[PDB]
Curated annotation (Swiss-Prot):
<feature type="binding site">
    <location>
        <position position="239"/>
    </location>
    <ligand>
        <name>AMP</name>
    </ligand>
</feature>
<feature type="domain" description="PDEase">
    <location>
        <begin position="2"/>
        <end position="329"/>
    </location>
</feature>
<comment type="subunit">
    <text>Homodimer for the long isoforms. Isoforms with truncated N-termini are monomeric. Isoform 3 is part of a ternary complex containing PRKAR2A, PRKAR2B and AKAP9. Interacts with PDE4DIP. Identified in a complex composed of RYR1, PDE4D, PKA, FKBP1A and protein phosphatase 1 (PP1). Isoform 5, isoform N3 and isoform 12 bind RACK1 via their unique N-terminus. Binds ARRB2. Interacts (via N-terminal region) with SHANK2 (via proline-rich region); the interaction is increased in a PKA-dependent manner.</text>
</comment>
<comment type="similarity">
    <text>Belongs to the cyclic nucleotide phosphodiesterase family. PDE4 subfamily.</text>
</comment>
<protein>
    <recommendedName>
        <fullName>3',5'-cyclic-AMP phosphodiesterase 4D</fullName>
    </recommendedName>
</protein>
<feature type="binding site">
    <location>
        <position position="287"/>
    </location>
    <ligand>
        <name>3',5'-cyclic AMP</name>
    </ligand>
</feature>
<feature type="binding site">
    <location>
        <position position="290"/>
    </location>
    <ligand>
        <name>AMP</name>
    </ligand>
</feature>
<feature type="binding site">
    <location>
        <position position="236"/>
    </location>
    <ligand>
        <name>Zn(2+) 1</name>
    </ligand>
</feature>
<feature type="binding site">
    <location>
        <position position="290"/>
    </location>
    <ligand>
        <name>3',5'-cyclic AMP</name>
    </ligand>
</feature>
<feature type="binding site">
    <location>
        <position position="119"/>
    </location>
    <ligand>
        <name>Zn(2+) 2</name>
    </ligand>
</feature>
<feature type="binding site">
    <location>
        <position position="119"/>
    </location>
    <ligand>
        <name>AMP</name>
    </ligand>
</feature>
<feature type="binding site">
    <location>
        <position position="119"/>
    </location>
    <ligand>
        <name>Mg(2+)</name>
    </ligand>
</feature>
<feature type="active site" description="Proton donor">
    <location>
        <position position="78"/>
    </location>
</feature>
<feature type="binding site">
    <location>
        <position position="119"/>
    </location>
    <ligand>
        <name>Zn(2+) 1</name>
    </ligand>
</feature>
<feature type="cross-link" description="Glycyl lysine isopeptide (Lys-Gly) (interchain with G-Cter in SUMO)">
    <location>
        <position position="3"/>
    </location>
</feature>
<feature type="binding site">
    <location>
        <position position="82"/>
    </location>
    <ligand>
        <name>Zn(2+) 1</name>
    </ligand>
</feature>
<feature type="binding site">
    <location>
        <position position="119"/>
    </location>
    <ligand>
        <name>Mn(2+)</name>
    </ligand>
</feature>
Length: 329
């Protein structure tokens, strides 16, 4: 009737679910490689989303396990642990004081569902690799946000498996709005969209308006979805902002995945993609470059939007950047 000793240690780790720096690798081990299922279940309960959207709990668990099973266990980075991490990171960003009572239950559901599906069935190679090899996926999506289109299509298609339709009790109006937001969020995870997303976030910080209660004013769809898009984008680019023990595990994983792509490119006589050549790699210099050109400008702009809620996240990012700089040989 009550939990095993393993289930109890897992539940104690899940008490950090509202904190930046959750031990997500430990949750992966303890859950029997079910980090996405257990973290999504915990967040759905915590935010009362089963009651709000009348999601049968058996349907939720069946869908979450099905979704987790369509992440590839042999992919070192773009797997269920990364999905779980982005979900939990989105969950913390949604709870930021500057956004209190800003977003509806449906918008919260969209951002979390989007986070959960955002990399499903990732083959561990880039859009460019799928385009250059003339893959079926690239043919299907006309070389345009190939992986991100595929993630969405799989995330939604899995709702049609036996007892998997977690949206069965939503009205058509709820479903159409949820779907448009989830699509808008996942398509924005394509790094080709980063510069336009960041420009729009900066424009929003420059024209920023606050309510009498001190929270952000977002009074049109365009502004609301832009913030959710940048939020899930920040969660996706949050590794360098985590405590260094977590950041370094993510770096080991992305470099294993990139080097594997580089090995496949070299064996096929293809040009080796940036940072994918294990014989010509500067892990440390690449991380400092990633932080300086991509991650820090994004998180600095996010920190301005929700000032001062993200100051400790930005501090961890700057400390991690200095640590990698100090190890450049
Ligand atoms: Mg992705
Ligand atoms: Zn991702």
């Amino acid at each position: 009737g009550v939990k095993t000793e393993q289930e109890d240690v897992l539940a104690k780790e899940l008490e950090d679910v509202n904190k930046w720096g959750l031990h997500v690798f430990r949750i992966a081990e303890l859950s029997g490689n079910r980090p996405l299922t257990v973290i999504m279940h915990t967040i759905f309960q915590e935010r009362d989303l089963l009651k709000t959207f009348k999601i049968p709990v058996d349907t939720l668990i069946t869908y979450l396990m099905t979704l987790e099973d369509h992440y590839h266990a042999d992919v070192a980075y773009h797997n269920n642990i990364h999905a779980a991490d982005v979900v939990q990171s989105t969950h913390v960003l949604l709870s930021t004081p500057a956004l209190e009572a800003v977003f509806t239950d449906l918008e919260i559901l969209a951002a979390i569902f989007a986070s959960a599906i955002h990399d499903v069935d990732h083959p561990g190679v880039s859009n460019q690799f799928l385009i250059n090899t003339n893959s079926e996926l690239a043919l299907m999506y006309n070389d345009s946000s190939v992986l991100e289109n595929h993630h969405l299509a799989v995330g939604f298609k899995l709702l049609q498996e036996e007892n998997c339709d977690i949206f069965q009790n939503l009205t058509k109006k709820q479903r159409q709005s949820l779907r448009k937001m989830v699509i808008d969020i996942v398509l924005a995870t394509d790094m080709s969209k980063h510069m336009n997303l960041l420009a729009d976030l900066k424009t929003m910080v420059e024209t920023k308006k606050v309510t009498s209660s001190g929270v952000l004013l977002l009074d049109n769809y365009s502004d609301r979805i832009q913030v959710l898009q940048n939020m899930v984008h920040c969660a996706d680019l949050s590794n360098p902002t985590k405590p260094l023990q977590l950041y370094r595990q993510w770096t080991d994983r992305i470099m294993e995945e990139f080097f594997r792509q580089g090995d496949r490119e070299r064996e096929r006589g293809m040009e080796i993609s940036p940072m994918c050549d294990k014989h010509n790699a500067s892990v440390e210099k690449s991380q400092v470059g990633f932080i300086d050109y991509i991650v820090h400008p994004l998180w600095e702009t996010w920190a301005d939007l929700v000032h001062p809620d993200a100051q400790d996240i930005l501090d961890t990012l700057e400390d991690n950047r200095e640590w990698y700089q100090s190890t450049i040989p």
